[PDB]
RNA sequence: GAAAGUUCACCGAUAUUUCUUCAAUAGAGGAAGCAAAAGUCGUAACAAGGUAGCUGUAGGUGAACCUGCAGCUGGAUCAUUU
């Protein structure tokens, strides 16, 4: 431990979800106009 | 002198069409967020939390996450060849 109460994932991996989320939902979009 | 009427130019209602632009709206299907707290699967985090923790980046994975490379101490070290 080093940090103080985060809670809600560790904020390095939240990241990381949230842009490979982004990504797929750009390529969708894109098609689909 | 002077009416109806003629012809040309100008101003131009209105309609139509083109371009431009703003506002508002139906919707198959797809994807998130939050509030409820006695559902389900695990145990990632807080003690060296039982693979120290965290940051940047790439890849992988049912999920919390895991793994490589480079950093920080907000560490578990303020410190051992005169």
């Not at 991996?13 to 106009?33: D, E, G, P, V």
């Amino acid at each position: 431990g080093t940090i103080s109460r985060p809670g809600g994932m560790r904020p390095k991996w939240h990241k990381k979800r949230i842009k490979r989320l982004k990504r797929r939902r750009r390529r969708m979009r894109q098609r689909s106009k």
